[PDB]
Amino acid sequence: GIPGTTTPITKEMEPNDDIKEANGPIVEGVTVKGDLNGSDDADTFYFDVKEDGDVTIELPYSGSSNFTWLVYKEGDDQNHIASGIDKNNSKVGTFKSTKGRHYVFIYKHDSASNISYSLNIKGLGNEKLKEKENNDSSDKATVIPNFNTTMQGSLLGDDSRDYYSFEVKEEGEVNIELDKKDEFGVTWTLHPESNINDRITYGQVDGNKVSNKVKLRPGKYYLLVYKYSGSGNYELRVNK
Ligand SMILES: [Ca+2]
Ligand SMILES: [Ca+2]
Ligand SMILES: [Ca+2]
Ligand SMILES: [Ca+2]
């Protein structure tokens, strides 16, 4: 039936020549490489839109410009809803969609052509996950699996600490935003895995958010969300 695997791809895997054998999932922030060389004239990928909004596909390429991409939404494999425009040696386009599975079908018109491409998709939205109690110590931290996840948590009553972990795979600035659903005293601290006492940064209140940006190098990190007054619910986004 419809593949439900959650492991993203970074590279195509033939055969992927129509919607029924599409490679995927492609996720935001992870580049996929492939090529349409010789008689390989079509490649198909799928991706999941997690929140309604505007989705952008950018496909930088080298080789012939004689090809394009079409997008289809699950449920209608005949009528494509968007196609790419050539701009500066890439095929780009933005289209509005609603949540659900979509397919990008890249195909060339002349089978003498050699084309290689990389594919970037943006604007897919965040998946919402719940924290997993008990997460009151770093060894029981709830894993944040990628940088397109909103974690939903609460600190009601006895529960005063929620530890989360995330991995940074390449150096860059990370944005940590806790959104307070209720008015209470909550904050967060960030720690390296190797030194749970070394405090790297601390969240700063700005209106209803407690946030900070920090440049981190590759590695695993612990994020402790803890309350110092009242009780309430929050959502937690770690963004790149
Ligand atoms: Ca291919
Ligand atoms: Ca193919
Ligand atoms: Ca909790
Ligand atoms: Ca907890």
Swiss-Prot record:
Binding, Ca(2+) 3: 12, 14, 40, 43
Family indicated by similarity: Belongs to the peptidase M9B family. Collagenase subfamily.
Residue span of region Collagen-binding: 224-228
Annotated site, C-terminus of form C1b, chain positions: 128
Phylogenetic placement of the source organism: Bacteria, Bacillati, Bacillota, Clostridia, Eubacteriales
Biotechnology (record note): Widely used for tissue dissociation due to their potent activity on connective tissue.
Binding-site list for Ca(2+) 5: 131, 133, 154, 159, 162
Residues binding Ca(2+) 6: 133, 135-136, 159, 161-162
Post-translational modification: Upon purification gives 67 kDa, 78 kDa, 82 kDa and 116 kDa (full-length) proteins all of which have the same N-terminus; only the longest form digests insoluble collagen. At least 2 in vivo isolated forms (C1b and C1c) are missing the second collagen-binding domain, ending on Lys-128 and Lys-140 respectively.
Protein name, UniProt field: Collagenase ColG
Binding site for Ca(2+) 4: 14, 16, 35, 40, 42-43
Species of origin: Hathewaya histolytica (Clostridium histolyticum)
Effect of residue 226 to F: S3b fragment has 12-fold decreased affinity for collagen
Domain notes: The mature protein has 4 domains; a metalloprotease domain (S1, approximately residues 111-786), S2 (877-882, equivalent to PKD), and 2 collagen-binding domains (CBD) S3a (997-1003) and S3b (1008-1118). The S1 domain has collagen hydrolytic activity. The metalloprotease S1 domain is composed of 3 subdomains which together resemble a saddle; an activator domain (residues 119-388), the catalytic peptidase subdomain (398-670) and a helper subdomain (679-790) joined by a Gly-rich hinge (387-397). The S2 domain (799-880, PKD) is flexible within a larger structure (S1 plus S2, residues 119-880).
Functional note: Clostridial collagenases are among the most efficient degraders of eukaryotic collagen known; saprophytes use collagen as a carbon source while pathogens additionally digest collagen to aid in host colonization. Has both tripeptidylcarboxypeptidase on Gly-X-Y and endopeptidase activities; the endopeptidase cuts within the triple helix region of collagen while tripeptidylcarboxypeptidase successively digests the exposed ends, thus clostridial collagenases can digest large sections of collagen.
Stretch list, region S3a collagen-binding domain: 8-125
Boundaries of the shown chain within the full protein: 883 to 1118 of 1118
Location of the protein in the cell: Secreted
